[PDB]
Amino acid sequence: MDIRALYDEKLTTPEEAVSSIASGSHLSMGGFAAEPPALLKALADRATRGDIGDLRVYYFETAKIAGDTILRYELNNRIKPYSMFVTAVERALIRRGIEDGGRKVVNYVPSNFHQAPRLLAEEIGIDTFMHTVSPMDCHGYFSLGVGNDYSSRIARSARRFIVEVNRYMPRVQGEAAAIHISEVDAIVENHVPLIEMPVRSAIPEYTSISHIIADLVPDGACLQMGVGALPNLVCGVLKDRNDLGIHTEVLNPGLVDLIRRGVVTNQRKTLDRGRSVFTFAMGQQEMYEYLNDHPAIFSRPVDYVNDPHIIAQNDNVVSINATLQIDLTGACNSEHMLGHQYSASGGQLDFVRGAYASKGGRSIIATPSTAAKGTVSRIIPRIDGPVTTPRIDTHYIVTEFGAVNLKGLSSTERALRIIELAHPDFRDELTQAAKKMHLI
Ligand SMILES: CC(C)(COP(=O)(O)OP(=O)(O)OC[C@H]1O[C@@H](n2cnc3c(N)ncnc32)[C@H](O)[C@@H]1OP(=O)(O)O)[C@@H](O)C(=O)NCCC(=O)NCCS
């Protein structure tokens, strides 16, 4: 009844809020802009004072917030990063580790993102969860804002849930996105602007790639755009379409632009008809402001959003994901390069599967054919590293040189067609490699 009393009972300082987290326990937190900076600074301070140890932190899509606080190299003996999505922050720590006498200082947890709630709650176990939230309303509810992902699950399965109120966090509607005061164990307040995703510049290959993708996007398509420079930028070629839908893992500025233009109506979707579905959002200040109180954008947990069976219920799904390497069988490595983990599988394989199962659906893995100012081919004979998308799941591949649909093709047909999507400079090498491997 008296929510203002409950609020005041639970309101405290960051120092006090983090002071009873146990050593030897498991902590998790929201992704990117949902990482709570005051709480994380106070947690890092505990580690600096030698007052906590053996604390595993399980998390994804790192921001400067955590990079500057609990993930500082000097604390890694006490706060152990268990990243589910490697970023520049972790890649820096890794390099520093190897410089520091070949030390290993970051842990990586492979996963399908649709399984992340189950992994965190049941396989791993999370004792404490921390997340930035929008302010409590007059009915006693906060919102997870840009986050839903696994947060909406782990906030409830965790034994303690600590929130950081920030009036800059948009109030977002969604499944389990609203948090009642009775579900929170402690509150701190810290009003600061959200962290922004950097804007990536286009490269010339995107003109051809975007035109090939545009021809593959049917009427009434239901869009998902993966993380990376390319998907967010490519979907701008769809500004002339109508009645598109959104069912995506990440909501990015490119998709929101299509909403703002009136391209996306969601009227052809079977599930969530009339609303754009996402599990978490990353962008700049303009996007975050636009999400606040939006009645046609609706977050849902990742065990719903990334479930292939759910994705498939909408007709004409179009999934556009990026990769680093494609081999001559159509297997893709989207997460590992130059000897180290670079990112993660994430929800890539979730959406490759879901999109093919959608009636009229298409999964696209798209990439420039080369890297390193044209000196390296992204089409290679054989992946030396982990496979993100196995050859039996890959549907379409697109480069600036065209498209191939791998489903039902023999190994010979796959290799010959993939070779013709490589840059001309590499096709003879690849053909000879295919012969040696007996693909052709
Ligand atoms: C594949 C993925 C890493 C691409 O992200 P990205 O930031 O767009 O990567 P880029 O293509 O720009 O490549 C990054 C750098 O590595 C280089 N590079 C890319 N592929 C390379 C390769 N095979 N060999 C050597 N260098 C390569 C690039 O030249 C680039 O260099 P730069 O720093 O000068 O720009 C990203 O999409 C990802 O993490 N995917 C997995 C998760 C996923 O698909 N989720 C879908 C649900 S959201």
Give 150 Cα–ligand 1 centroid separation in angstroms: 24
Q: Do 366 and 213 form a contact (C-beta atoms < 8 A)?
A: yes
- 332-333, strands of its sheet edge to edge: 332-333, 325-327, 379-380
Is 103 annotated as ligand-binding? no
User: 10 Å Cβ neighbour count for 217?
Assistant: 19
Is the separation of the CB atoms in 66 and 37 below 8 Å?
A: no
Cα of 367 vs centre of ligand 1, distance in Å, is 9
Centre of ligand 1 from the C-alpha of residue 207, in Å: 18
Spacing of C-alpha 326 from chain mean position: 21
Measured in degrees and rounded to the nearest 5, phi and psi for residue 227 equal -65, 155
Q: Which residue has the tokens 């954008």?
A: 297
Tokens for 278?
């996402």
Contact between 60 and 29 (Cβ < 8 Å): no
* Coil, helix or strand at residue 235: helix
Strands (E), 284-392: 297-299, 317-322, 325-327, 332-333, 336-337, 340-341, 362-366, 370-371, 376-377, 379-380
Q: Note whether 349 and 395 are within 8 A (CB).
A: no
The CB of 347 under 6 Å from ligand 1? The reply is yes
Distance 369 CA to ligand 1 centre (A): 12
Q: Note whether 395 and 407 are within 8 A (CB).
A: yes
Report which protein residue has its CA nearest ligand 1's atom 28. Answer: 371
- Whether ligand 1 lies within 6 angstroms of the CB of 340 is answered as no
Closest among 368, 423, 372 to 399, alpha carbons compared: 368
Tell me the sheet residues that pair with 403: 398
Q: At 86, which helix (H) or strand (E)?
A: none
CB 209 within 8 A of CB 231: no
Residue with tokens 């959608």: 358
Residue bearing tokens 């975007």: 210
220: left (phi over 0), alpha (psi -120 to 50) or beta: left
Question: Using CA atoms, how far apart are residues 111 and 93, in angstroms rounded to an integer?
Answer: 21
Alpha helices in 108-228 (DSSP H): 116-118, 151-157, 205-216
Question: Strand locations in 110-237, DSSP E?
Answer: 128-133, 141-143, 160-165, 178-180, 186-189, 222-225
Residue of 61, 62, 227 with the most ligand 1 atoms within 8 Å of its CB, for mutation: 227
Q: Which residue has the tokens 């992340």?
A: 116
Report which ligand 1 atom has the smallest distance to the Cα of 343: 39
Task: Give the distance (Å) from ligand 1 centre to CA of residue 214.
Answer: 21
Q: CA 184 to CA 109: how far, in whole Å?
A: 27
Helix (H, G, I), strand (E, B) or coil at 372: coil
Q: Whose CA is nearest to atom 39 of ligand 1?
A: 343
Any alpha helices (H) in 49-186, and if so which ranges?
Answer: 64-67, 88-99, 116-118, 151-157
CB of 401 closer than 8 Å to CB of 355: no
Q: Is 271 annotated as a binding residue?
A: no
- CA distances (Å), 389 to each of 38, 127, 173, 345, 359, in order? 38, 32, 32, 8, 21
Q: Could you give the CA distance from residue 28 to residue 155 in angstroms, rounded to a whole number?
A: 9
Q: Please state how this structure was obtained.
A: X-ray
**Is 91 part of any known ligand binding site?**
yes
Which 3 state secondary structure label does DSSP give 397?
A: strand
Give, as one character, the DSSP assignment of residue 335. S
Check residue 276 and report its DSSP letter.
Answer: E
Is 372 known as a binding-site position? Answer: yes
Q: How deeply is 79 buried, as exposed, middle or buried, from its count of CB atoms within 10 A (0-12, 13-18, 19+)?
A: buried
Contact criterion met (CB below 8 Å) for 394 and 405: no
Q: What residues have CB less than 8 Å from 87, skipping those under 6 apart?
A: 61, 62, 343
Closest CA to 406 of 333, 329, 354: 329
Query: Whose CA is closest to 94, among 82, 84, 107, 85?
Result: 107
Number of the ligand 1 atom closest to the C-alpha atom of 227: 48
Q: In a 3-state reduction of DSSP, which class is residue 284? A: coil
Q: Which residue has the tokens 């067609």?
A: 417
Tell me if 289 is assigned to a ligand binding site.
no
**Best CA proximity match to 150, nearest among 188, 186, 177:** 177
The owner of tokens 């009915």 is: 139
Q: How big is the CA angle at 31 (ends 146 and 12), to the nearest 5 degrees?
A: 85
Q: Measured in angstroms, how far is the CA atom of residue 96 from the centroid of ligand 1?
A: 21
Task: Quickly count: other Cβ atoms within 10 Å of residue 432's Cβ.
Answer: 12
Burial of 20 (0-12, 13-18, 19+ CB in 10 A): exposed
Query: What is the identity of the amino acid at 175?
Result: E
| Helix or strand run (H / E) with residue 290 | helix 285-291
The secondary structure of the chain in percent helix, strand, coil, rounded to multiples of 5, reads: 35, 20, 45
| 148, 324, 345, 364: residue to mutate for ligand 1 pocket, most atoms within 8 A of CB | 324
- For ligand 1, atom 48, the nearest C-alpha belongs to 226
Cβ neighbours of 270 (radius 10 Å): 14
Residue 322 near ligand 1, beta carbon < 6 Å: yes
Please give the positions annotated as active site. 249
**Residue 159, H or E segment:** none
Contact call for residues 271 and 242 (beta carbons, < 8 A): no
**DSSP assignment letter at 257:** H
The rounded Cα 211 to chain-centroid distance in angstroms is 25
For 264, which DSSP code? B
Q: From residue 213, how far is each of 313, 355, 410 by CA, in Å? A: 22, 14, 24
CA-atom Rg of the chain in angstroms: 22
Separation between Cα atoms, residue 53 and residue 137, nearest integer Å: 36
Q: In this structure, are residues 396 and 418 in contact, taking their beta carbons and an 8 Å threshold?
A: no
Find all residues with CB under 8 Å of 174, minimum gap 6, and list them.
144, 148, 152, 298, 299, 300
**348 marked ligand binding residue:** yes
